[PDB]
Amino acid sequence: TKIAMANFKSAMPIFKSHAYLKELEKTLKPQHFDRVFVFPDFFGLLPNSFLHFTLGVQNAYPRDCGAFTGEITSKHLEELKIHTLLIGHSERRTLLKESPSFLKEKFDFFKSKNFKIVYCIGEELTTREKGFKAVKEFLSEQLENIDLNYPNLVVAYEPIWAIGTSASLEDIYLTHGFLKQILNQKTPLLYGGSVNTQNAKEILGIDSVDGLLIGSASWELENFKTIISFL
Amino acid sequence: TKIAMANFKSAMPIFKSHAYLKELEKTLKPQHFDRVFVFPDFFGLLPNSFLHFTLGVQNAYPRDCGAFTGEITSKHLEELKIHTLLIGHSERRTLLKESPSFLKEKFDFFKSKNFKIVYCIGEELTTREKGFKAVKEFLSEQLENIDLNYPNLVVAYEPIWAIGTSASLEDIYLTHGFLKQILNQKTPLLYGGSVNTQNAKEILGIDSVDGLLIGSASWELENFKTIISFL
Ligand SMILES: O=C(CCC1CCCCC1)N(CCO)C[C@H](O)[C@H](O)[C@H](O)[C@H](O)CO
């Protein structure tokens, strides 16, 4: 089976998120544990007692604990038994200005904690429009920031122009084909960006697509359930 | 002189924070409601049903909800019935790179929702080195960034060089004295930066000090309760 990950972003009400988790846990079985992932916000999550899917957080500060006002640190996550994290999502790079150095600080830190890391990359439409060389250069430069051989690494390719809008199959086939040349053959490579119940199955048909990172469409349990069925 | 606020930052275990809030509620009375403040991290807080102290958050993104990976938004706080927030704390300005325009965005957004705002300001040691005229000009520019007449505003003067180590009574008397010359007369002006059970009473003795923003020293409930008796 392939991968399916839900990114709640900051769109799910606290109560709705909590029920979502409990329901999902009842609908899924043990074999979905390492196939399905859910990333709710700090309020929407719950202690990690789930055995049918993987619980992760959308962000964290790269320190055990301390004077980091407004931030969540690793000891807290350890207390919640969460050990999966998103890093470099486009929204944080742009709206919250997380530079490459900061993202590298996070990767190195959480890697040292043996976390499963879903590292996000993606180019702007302008880069896409400059040609193949421009996209290859941009993406390969983003991957230089991390350790591509860390076995608990997952790379999520989300073209920025497709987040919250969807990349064409031709686009996904060629881009992922290139990425597969740069990444460890064991690293799962997910496609993200406007994935929905309508285009999921097709996206999943590309051999260089090991899974999906679903934002908007996953905020409805049933939609996610349906996507899971295509895995 | 009458207000005490606790900033848990990212230093308190989840279970401890929860127990802290419940115990504080049992200890204090209704008279402490608008005099005592507690700001736990996102995990350490609980639904706001507290009547003996005010519950607040250390940060939030200026939107009702949406595609903001890693952020907590307005609607989330409404569910928890939280309408008190910290903005501009030094740790976020530097470590998280929150610019003045970003802080202003947060201020204007939560202003519209009648949130009680605790706007933090404080100069670097380098600035203090130059001279009082240097700090006065630096502080002015920081205050230049918001609406000083906002009825639910609270300003917290916190010398960056005194965070996590305390400013002399002399520098507090002078710097607050200056701040009282541009701030609205009714705006509570707090002092923060290495406030502890040992210097609490004296700081509070200064007329231009309306309260304290307590960090590391508040992590131990008994320390917080002691400082409360000085109000
Ligand atoms: O093809 C593209 C973008 C491709 C790039 C290629 C490089 C030059 C700029 C253009 N889009 C972008 C639109 O976001 C169209 C969508 O792939 C289709 O509209 C979608 O697959 C279909 O409607 C599903 O039923």
From Swiss-Prot, chains A, B:
Keywords: Cytoplasm, Gluconeogenesis, Glycolysis, Isomerase
Family: Belongs to the triosephosphate isomerase family.
Protein's name according to its UniProt entry: Triosephosphate isomerase
Physiological role: Involved in the gluconeogenesis. Catalyzes stereospecifically the conversion of dihydroxyacetone phosphate (DHAP) to D-glyceraldehyde-3-phosphate (G3P).
PROSITE patterns registered for this protein in UniProt: TIM_1 (PS00171), TIM_2 (PS51440)
Xref: Pfam families: TIM
Keyword Cytoplasm: yes
This protein's record includes keyword rRNA processing: no
Record PANTHER family: TRIOSEPHOSPHATE ISOMERASE
